[PDB]
Design a protein around this ligand. Structure first.
Ligand SMILES: *C(=N)[C@H](C[C@@H]1CCNC1=O)NC(=O)[C@@H]1[C@@H]2[C@H](CN1C(=O)[C@@H](NC(=O)C(F)(F)F)C(C)(C)C)C2(C)C
Ligand SMILES: *C(=N)[C@H](C[C@@H]1CCNC1=O)NC(=O)[C@@H]1[C@@H]2[C@H](CN1C(=O)[C@@H](NC(=O)C(F)(F)F)C(C)(C)C)C2(C)C
Lengths: 302, 305
């Protein structure tokens, strides 16, 4: 029993974290085979943070301007290219700790683990979800940049996120490992703010199913709802609209518990109507939205 | 900025997890140098768990009774010994990934990282506190036994916990790596219950300090209390007493925020009496007590390797 916000073992990613330095800028790099991936804004001074021309700044750089350090070893840089907002440094050594990996772009709602690093040393690991507004509610200080988000599937590491910047509201923005930003952000210091956040409705229902399987039944009820009446009510609490696709994904938890998704939707509407009246679900007095249907099955049946 | 329940990187510890099988029981082992550590109750059958005679059950067992598997490779057991509630199996091979490590035993309120494992394969890492009643609120299914708790200080892994059992209340109990239980528990299937839990007061106050640092400041009030007067409120609300010791630990956070510890106590007191009056603190409707002062500093400022 028990239910924990639980990250993947960070071991396979720890073996890939290096320090990338350029001028007075030091941030973190991901060393896979003979390529170090890191945020391109490493090549910006304080000045060129406002309207950087990355193409112009990079053409000024030779291989020898990039100090790559893996623990003690300085890697020798033998090539640099840019792909979108990530800089790719070719090094003369393939990383011997390179795991089986892929690059994946995730959708809002998806969870992944973040290995927070400073100076190419891993600090800590925590579990994140991609918010509907394409930000993550992370924990990152100065020099954290180039810290990555990942999933692990059997022995394969799925890299989905590289950290770039903090927005004024304290939420974080970054790119996939092809360097395309999640959402409408750019690696410039400009007036840009996170859109209005919403609750990830599909995740809350999943978490309620976890509550049932872990033997908590105090919040259900005898009502059901139409998908439309559910969405019309939920949306007034800033909940993401639930789609037929979301219901389909809840098939397995519905079947395992024998509570139809629209029945559990009825429970949710009433929980929003009523709150907790003291009580808790799975040790929380808020409705948890950073557990996907997959995360529940893995932790409560695996 | 931001504040998360954050675990230590598990790499050094993932390199030490093995599978131990004795008869039809499989669980997890910790492989360090040429010894494998795992719960002694691996030797117990369903029958033997009700009234086990460990010294007797153990002496009836030869090394050939113990399958130790590191991935696909069999390790050869060349010796076996018991220390308190942990079985120590000498294996023919030293673990080449053995980190700098020591065994430490923690007090309630201290936090640590748990690496949950099944069949010697690490599944997940989460952050835990040793509860005041010496349980931990874990997430552990069948085969999780031999999952370890640790902290890291630079390159030294300090192992502090090995998982043994689930209490009927759904909370978890285990030992230090010398096999001494945390709390008044025994490794038999017999009926056991967690005593009544209390809230780790110093940790809430540390967490409230973490709130102030992230600009969540609404709960500050003008009032200050005294330790004596506060601790009377604490007891009523099933809160651990705040000691002179506890107050001194918070000096860094008091100094960093300019909020006196007994001032922060007044905010806390008022919160217990009044509730949160709608609001949340760092996105929680509950007062959080599983972040230590050291945990808060290692994330909100640095010292984070
Ligand atoms: C990488 N080391 C930091 C990560 C930041 C620092 C504080 N916590 C973090 O997660 N990244 C940066 O310094 C990026 C970098 C320029 C400015 N910047 C920011 O994080 C800033 N953000 C913005 O100005 C905003 F909102 F517009 F994006 C700041 C708020 C000053 C921390 C670039 C290229 C975005
Ligand atoms: C190790 N593989 C399991 C892990 C358990 C399984 C359910 N959740 C967990 O964390 N631990 C055990 O097999 C221990 C072990 C015998 C029985 N046991 C229990 O978990 C039982 N608990 C107790 O006996 C209790 F409550 F009294 F502490 C169970 C009835 C399954 C809850 C021994 C030696 C205690």
């Amino acid at each position: 029993s028990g239910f924990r916000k639980m990250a993947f073992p960070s071991g396979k990613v720890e073996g890939c974290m290096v320090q990338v330095t350029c001028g007075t800028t030091t941030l973190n790099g991901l060393w896979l085979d003979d390529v170090v991936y890191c945020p391109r804004h490493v090549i910006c001074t304080s000045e060129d943070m406002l309207n950087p021309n990355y193409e112009d700044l990079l053409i000024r750089k030779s291989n020898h301007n990039f100090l790559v350090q893996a623990g003690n070893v300085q890697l020798r840089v033998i090539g640099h290219s840019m792909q979108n907002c990530v800089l790719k440094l070719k090094v003369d050594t393939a990383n011997p700790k390179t795991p089986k990996y892929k690059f994946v772009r995730i959708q809002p709602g998806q969870t992944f683990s973040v290995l927070a690093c400073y100076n190419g040393s891993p600090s800590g690991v925590y579990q994140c979800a991609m918010r509907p507004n394409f930000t993550i509610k992370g924990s990152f200080l100065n020099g954290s940049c180039g810290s990555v988000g990942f999933n692990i599937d059997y022995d394969c590491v799925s890299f989905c996120y590289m950290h770039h910047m903090e927005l004024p509201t304290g939420v974080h923005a970054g790119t996939d490992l092809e360097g395309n930003f999640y959402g409408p952000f750019v690696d410039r210091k400009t007036a840009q703010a996170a859109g209005t956040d919403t609750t990830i409705t599909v995740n809350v229902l999943a978490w309620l199913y976890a509550a049932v399987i872990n033997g908590d039944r105090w919040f259900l009820n005898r009502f059901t709802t139409t998908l439309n009446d559910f969405n019309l009510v939920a949306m007034k609490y800033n909940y993401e609209p639930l789609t037929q696709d979301h219901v389909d994904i809840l098939g397995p938890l519905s079947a395992q518990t024998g509570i139809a998704v629209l029945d559990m939707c009825a429970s949710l509407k009433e929980l929003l109507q009523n709150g907790m009246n003291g009580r808790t679900i799975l040790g929380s007095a808020l409705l948890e939205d950073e557990f996907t249907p997959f995360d529940v099955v893995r932790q409560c049946s695996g």
